[PDB]
Write an enzyme that holds these catalytic residues in place. Structure first.
Site, PDB file in Angstrom:
ATOM      1  CD  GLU A 159      96.081  40.916  39.225  1.00 46.23           C
ATOM      2  OE1 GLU A 159      96.701  41.862  39.242  1.00 46.23           O
ATOM      3  OE2 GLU A 159      94.883  40.727  38.295  1.00 46.23           O
ATOM      4  CD  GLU A 187      44.865  51.807  38.921  1.00 39.88           C
ATOM      5  OE1 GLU A 187      45.131  50.679  39.642  1.00 39.88           O
ATOM      6  OE2 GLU A 187      43.883  52.226  38.738  1.00 39.88           O
ATOM      7  CD1 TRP A 218      29.292  50.251  33.672  1.00 38.26           C
ATOM      8  CD2 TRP A 218      30.899  51.522  34.148  1.00 38.26           C
ATOM      9  NE1 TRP A 218      29.999  49.676  34.368  1.00 38.26           N
ATOM     10  CE2 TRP A 218      31.044  50.520  34.734  1.00 38.26           C
ATOM     11  CE3 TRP A 218      31.837  52.613  33.612  1.00 38.26           C
ATOM     12  CZ2 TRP A 218      32.170  50.397  35.429  1.00 38.26           C
ATOM     13  CZ3 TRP A 218      32.943  52.255  34.683  1.00 38.26           C
ATOM     14  CH2 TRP A 218      33.226  51.256  35.598  1.00 38.26           C
ATOM     15  CD  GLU A 234      34.691  48.272  40.706  1.00 37.97           C
ATOM     16  OE1 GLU A 234      35.696  47.931  40.854  1.00 37.97           O
ATOM     17  OE2 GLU A 234      34.242  48.869  39.561  1.00 37.97           O
TER      18      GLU A 234
HETATM   19 CA   LIG Z   1      92.935  40.410  37.159  1.00 41.60          CA
END
Ligand SMILES: [Ca+2]
EC number: 3.2.1.96
Length: 787
Positions: free
Chosen positions: A780, A141, A29, A243
């Site tokens: 546990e 980009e 342009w 620019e």
């Molecule tokens: Ca466990």
């Protein structure tokens, strides 16, 4: 025709016949033939026709130009013709969104093998063939707002590979260029990694500063990665001209700032990042291909002053340099001649590499330019009977592998004909050196004589491999090769210390890859023993000669060949040995308790499982007995079926898996889980992993169980498959149906205690209170025993 001129131009670029390149992005342009959607011309001041010879490639960067604009005809039937006459190529730029389904023709085609192959063709026809240009450039980009999907990148890459079958170096039509331009490092660029082999050039935008005192840190960092996919002669770096009306986020200062005292300051390149980029070269690989500018139509306009760095689209701060004006491409032309005058792009000539056959093979493998020599860092293979001298090969000071094959007429190898990297463990392969008469490798810290074909050095009259890092001890393979070298000298001459030098070796030390003791033993002497000192110790040479302690090193230093001692006199054990700095010892006792210590105290019969780690991996695993040992217990509970609980029944079963990656708690300070071990076996110990054990979520000790009771079912005869769900739960909650076997009363991270040889098939664990107000959790539960 200008299709055959275009082909000739593209083939001269791709084969590297123009030296360093300068390229530019021309904004469509800002060409005077450009018209908007209104049909009005946008800017009459500039034209692509005026782009000089110094610009090697012109990139058509399209925006705002409408599709019916006269510009496209002016491009195809006039501009490309004029620019081809001066040796300039045209390349069309498109974003990656034309490839992945988001824009343009990619919305009209399915994401299937045939669909993407039709898309590729439609793109090459619409953006290359119909525009008249000489190649395509895909812009990839970073997507700040709305990132790209892995499916969009997988598509873009598949379309890109189909485009690369049509045009480019690996394509049907070799007369077109195929280029990528990007802002993405290799780590973040899956498309580049997949398409690199089919690329002519990679244009990496580096607008503005890139870190560090030279403002070029990210360039060097990224080339360190890029070099594994493309050649330096394919790598171009870009700067941006100023620019018009650019705002914060788009103000790079790549050219000089406005001077009210000097209207031509904009076309002075001294001080500019554009100049620094023209001069920048890679450290490794070779010399770069060139530089490119964005917005070449703005060449020579001075940059807006630093004081404007903060303008926005909302906060306008317009300056005189925001005007549009005609350009004569002064900065472009200065930067181009600056790069062609760079004396690093002078071709390698007879001054550098005197031997013509050597020089042909270096140029074929390393590149054309003098500057490629100190940068190349891959492999060089030299062959044949034509090479007489190796002078000039010392200029390849970053070579990683040198390979000499059948150099029948080479009579001399000396450290000054060799690259500097031979001193930092570069590979060296020699085969069929039937003419070699002097083999001098002194002072190159070589760890091995591997790859040297000693059998074929049949004319050898002297050698010197002294001051290296060789293991020349009896069982070493390097001593066997040393012997052959001495015999080849004996055929021609009396052996002397001067013509068979090999003394002052300083072999480096390594960790052994394995250790002997699979099963150790201590008596019960009531004393502390170090597992590292006793079982996991010592150092090895590169040829795996074991040295256990300082005395073994003393015996090694006295090793000799024909009474000539080869190890350096002042080489010390501290310098050879490996300290075991990072090393840790993981012990698993017979009750499955885990501790991390190298020391053990031999007080009772016991068995440990030992796992030694160096900070990263397990280097050794053994079993260790103290006295009579102890049978390794099993976790009876692992996989126990939950038969009832006051909490959630699916949370409960996760205290009987392997992990600590879970938690069981209730809406309260108390709860119970009752479980079934399947069969009935004998239980000697139990272990509870408290709340602070938790591996998925960091839990503080305030959530720990503080009081609790492990229990077995009082009635041994009871069958509870017979009573139904509502009764069973009420039965398993009634505390008069269980007897305490173990009682916890301490909020330890891991609580362990002994049972009195409990044989039971039904169990219950009750939490009776927490460390704090909070609901107590645990991860546990272990019942430990045999069978
Ligand atoms: Ca466990």
């Amino acid at each position: 025709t200008d299709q055959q001129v275009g082909a000739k131009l593209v083939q001269e670029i791709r084969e590297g016949k123009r030296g360093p390149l300068y390229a530019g992005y021309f904004r469509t342009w800002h060409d005077r033939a450009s018209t908007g959607i209104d049909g009005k011309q946008q800017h009459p001041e500039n034209t692509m026709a005026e782009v000089p010879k110094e610009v090697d490639i012109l990139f058509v960067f399209h925006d705002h130009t409408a599709s019916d604009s006269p510009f496209w005809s002016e491009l195809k039937d006039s501009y490309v013709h004029k620019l081809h006459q001066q040796g300039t190529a045209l390349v069309q730029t498109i974003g990656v969104n034309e490839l992945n389904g988001r824009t343009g023709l990619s919305k009209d085609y399915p994401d299937t093998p045939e669909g993407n192959k039709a898309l590729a063709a439609a793109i090459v026809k619409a953006f290359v063939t119909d525009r008249g240009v000489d190649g395509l450039d895909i812009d990839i980009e970073h997507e700040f707002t709305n990132k790209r999907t892995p499916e969009e990148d997988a598509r873009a890459l598949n379309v890109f590979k189909e485009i690369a079958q049509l045009i480019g170096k690996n394509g049907s039509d070799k007369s077109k260029l195929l280029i990528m331009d990007t802002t993405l490092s290799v780590e973040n660029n899956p498309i580049f990694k997949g398409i690199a082999e089919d690329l002519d050039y990679l244009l990496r935008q580096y607008y503005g500063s890139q870190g560090g005192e030279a403002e070029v840190d990210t360039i060097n960092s990224d080339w360190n990665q890029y070099q594994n996919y493309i050649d330096a002669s394919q790598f171009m770096i870009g700067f941006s001209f100023f620019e018009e009306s650019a705002s914060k986020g788009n103000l790079w200062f790549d050219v000089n700032e406005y001077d009210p005292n000097n209207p031509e300051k904009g076309k002075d390149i001294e001080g500019t990042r554009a100049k620094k980029y023209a001069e920048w070269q890679p450290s490794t690989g070779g010399l770069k291909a060139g530089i490119f500018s964005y917005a070449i139509d703005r060449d020579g306009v001075a940059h807006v002053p630093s004081t404007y760095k903060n303008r926005t689209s909302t906060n306008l701060q317009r300056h005189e340099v925001d005007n549009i004006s005609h350009t004569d491409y002064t900065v472009s032309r200065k930067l181009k001649t600056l790069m062609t005058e760079d004396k690093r792009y002078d071709v390698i000539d007879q001054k550098d590499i005197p031997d013509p056959a050597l020089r042909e093979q270096i140029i074929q493998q390393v590149g054309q330019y003098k500057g490629d020599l100190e940068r190349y860092n891959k492999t060089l293979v030299l062959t044949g009977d034509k090479i007489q001298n190796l002078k000039g090969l010392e200029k390849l000071s970053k070579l990683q592998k040198l390979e000499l094959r059948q150099l029948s007429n080479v009579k001399e190898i000396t450290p000054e004909l060799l690259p500097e990297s031979m001193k930092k463990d570069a590979e060296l392969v020699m085969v069929g050196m039937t003419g070699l008469e002097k083999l001098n490798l002194s002072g190159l810290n070589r760890q091995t004589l591997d790859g040297i074909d000693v059998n074929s050095i049949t004319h050898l009259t002297s050698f010197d491999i002294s001051h290296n890092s060789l293991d020349l001890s009896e069982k070493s393979e390097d001593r066997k090769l040393l012997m052959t070298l001495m015999e080849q000298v004996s055929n021609h001459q009396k052996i002397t210390v001067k013509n068979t030098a090999f003394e002052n070796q300083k072999p480096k030390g390594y960790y052994p890859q394995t250790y002997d003791t699979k099963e150790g033993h201590y008596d019960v002497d009531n004393a502390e023993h170090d597992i590292l000192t006793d079982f996991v110790f010592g150092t090895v040479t590169k040829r795996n000669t074991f040295i256990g302690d300082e005395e073994a090193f003393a015996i090694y230093k006295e090793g000799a060949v024909d009474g000539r001692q080869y190890v350096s006199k002042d080489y010390t054990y501290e310098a050879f040995r490996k300290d075991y700095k990072g090393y840790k010892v993981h012990l698993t006792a017979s009750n499955l308790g885990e501790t991390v210590t190298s020391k053990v105290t031999a007080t009772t019969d016991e068995t440990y499982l030992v796992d030694v780690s160096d900070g990263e991996k397990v280097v050794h695993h053994m079993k260790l007995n103290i006295g009579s040992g102890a049978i390794m217990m099993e976790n009876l509970a692992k996989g126990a079926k939950v038969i009832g609980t006051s909490g959630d029944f699916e949370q409960a079963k996760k205290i009987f898996d392997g992990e600590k990656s879970d938690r069981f708690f209730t809406w309260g300070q108390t709860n119970w889980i009752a479980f079934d071990l399947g069969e009935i076996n004998l239980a000697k110990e139990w272990r509870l992993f408290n709340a602070e054990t938790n591996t998925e979520i960091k839990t503080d000790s305030s959530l720990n169980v503080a009081k609790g009771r492990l229990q077995i079912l009082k009635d041994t005869t009871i069958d509870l498959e017979k009573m139904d769900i509502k009764n069973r739960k009420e039965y398993l909650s009634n505390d008069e149906n269980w007897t305490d076997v173990a009682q916890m009363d301490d909020a330890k991270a891991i609580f362990n205690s002994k049972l009195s040889n409990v044989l039971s098939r039904y169990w219950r664990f009750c939490v009776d209170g927490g460390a704090s107000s909070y609901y107590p959790q645990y991860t546990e539960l272990q019942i430990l025993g045999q069978r």
